[PDB]
Design an enzyme around this catalytic site. Structure first.
Site, short mmCIF file in Angstrom:
data_model
loop_
_atom_site.label_atom_id
_atom_site.label_comp_id
_atom_site.label_asym_id
_atom_site.label_seq_id
_atom_site.Cartn_x
_atom_site.Cartn_y
_atom_site.Cartn_z
N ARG A 1 -3.51 -0.50 5.48
CA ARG A 1 -4.03 -2.00 4.81
C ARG A 1 -2.48 -3.21 4.63
NH1 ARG A 1 -5.11 1.97 0.10
NH2 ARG A 1 -3.71 3.01 0.70
N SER A 2 -2.22 -2.65 3.71
CA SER A 2 -1.07 -4.08 3.60
C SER A 2 -0.31 -4.91 5.27
CB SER A 2 -0.01 -3.51 2.78
OG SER A 2 1.19 -2.20 3.36
N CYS B 1 1.10 -1.01 0.35
CA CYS B 1 -0.02 0.13 -0.24
C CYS B 1 0.81 1.15 -0.20
CB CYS B 1 -1.45 0.18 1.18
SG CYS B 1 -0.47 -0.60 2.79
N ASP C 1 -8.00 3.73 1.76
CA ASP C 1 -7.04 4.04 2.32
C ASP C 1 -8.28 3.93 3.39
OD1 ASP C 1 -5.59 5.49 4.44
OD2 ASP C 1 -4.29 6.73 1.97
N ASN D 1 2.34 1.31 4.26
CA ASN D 1 2.89 0.41 4.52
C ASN D 1 2.19 0.52 5.67
OD1 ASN D 1 5.77 -1.32 5.43
ND2 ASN D 1 3.16 -3.01 4.51
#
Length: 153
Positions: free
Chosen positions: A14-15, A8, A125, A11
């Site tokens: 989301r990721s 993303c 996001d 970091n």
């Protein structure tokens, strides 16, 4: 051994959730040893930082272990990972740009949401959102990671 890097912009929101969800899925299926799992950022905005605390609160509610230190994707990542799965089209534009600056690109680069059976393509996001937006990200990661594990394209 198979590998996947979730990506993303920063970091933190989301990721790290995608990574943690995916690692739990493979661990539950006795195959964590067969998989290299990681997450990274397109940008350097949050390097060194742990996941958004709102994300940690969400993962705690769902009993999913999460621990990460934010890092930026490197040129080496395109050579080593089988899959780079990102969150939104902006991530995808950026990753494609970076990937063309590199000699070796083993990685298949695509949106994680392209695996959603429910066709919720974009994982938005949630930084400027609230707890309910982290929950949506979480639920998307669940559907997408399960489907990806089932059959990668």
């Amino acid at each position: 051994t198979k590998s996947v890097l979730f990506v993303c912009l920063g970091n933190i929101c989301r990721s790290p959730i995608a990574e943690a969800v995916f690692r739990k899925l493979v661990t539950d299926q006795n195959i964590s040893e067969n998989w290299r799992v990681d997450s990274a950022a397109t940008s350097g905005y949050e390097i060194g930082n742990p996941p958004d605390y709102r994300g940690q609160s969400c993962m705690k509610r769902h009993g999913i272990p999460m621990s990460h230190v934010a890092r930026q994707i490197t040129k080496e990542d395109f050579a080593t990972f089988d899959y780079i799965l990102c969150m939104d089209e902006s991530n995808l534009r950026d990753l494609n740009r970076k990937s063309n600056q590199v000699k070796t690109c083993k990685a298949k680069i695509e949106l994680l949401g392209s695996y959603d059976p429910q066709k919720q393509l974009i994982i938005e996001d949630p930084y400027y959102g609230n707890d309910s937006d982290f929950e949506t990200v979480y639920q998307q990661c669940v559907r997408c990671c399960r489907a990806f594990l089932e059959k990668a394209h």
